[PDB]
RNA sequence: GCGGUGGAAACUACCAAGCUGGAGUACGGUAGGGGCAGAGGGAAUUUCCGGUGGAGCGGUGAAAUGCGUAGAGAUCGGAAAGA
């Protein structure tokens, strides 16, 4: 069983409502994912930093079948789950290699509504 | 107040000949999202197709409408298009 891929990039879609932590390989194929509204609590109880750690710590139950040694991290977008997702992945067992911020910086053109966030 | 006559002449005005500080022009340079037209560049968003993969995603002061196992979101590769 399993493909047994060495290292891989971890795409963390950090938003205000929730945080989707997905651990993918070298190419871009997802093995298994984990989210904030999946781990027990839902509604508005998520999106917080220590709710992101229970989400990123739920991935090591489904991706343990592959057996990854090293891991590169990748954060996208603002919110309370940027530095928190990196701390849970570190206390799990996998090593650090490349932490990058691929947040889409606009060239001042497209603008969404004002509205207050959580 | 109006008209006429005889004067005065600085000022205003008319005429003639000038002068120059006004203004204008040329010579040589400087900065600027000045304007019009035609190209081309980068990020991102949306959409279409395909791969991986899982049940959730989206949203709010809370929720719900909505999008989801005819499998989105997320992720990767490619395309199209507009600002």
Curated annotation (Swiss-Prot):
GO terms for biological process: translation. It comes from the Eukaryota. It is found in: Plastid, Chloroplast. InterPro entries: Ribosomal_uS11, Ribosomal_uS11_bac-type, Ribosomal_uS11_CS, Ribosomal_uS11_sf. GO terms for cellular component: chloroplast; ribonucleoprotein complex; ribosome. Pfam families: Ribosomal_S11. PROSITE patterns: RIBOSOMAL_S11. One of its GO terms (molecular function) is rRNA binding. Keywords: Chloroplast, Plastid, Ribonucleoprotein, Ribosomal protein, RNA-binding, rRNA-binding. Belongs to the universal ribosomal protein uS11 family. Component of the chloroplast small ribosomal subunit (SSU). Mature 70S chloroplast ribosomes of higher plants consist of a small (30S) and a large (50S) subunit. The 30S small subunit contains 1 molecule of ribosomal RNA (16S rRNA) and 24 different proteins. The 50S large subunit contains 3 rRNA molecules (23S, 5S and 4.5S rRNA) and 33 different proteins. uS11c interacts with bS21c. This is Small ribosomal subunit protein uS11c. It comes from Spinacia oleracea.
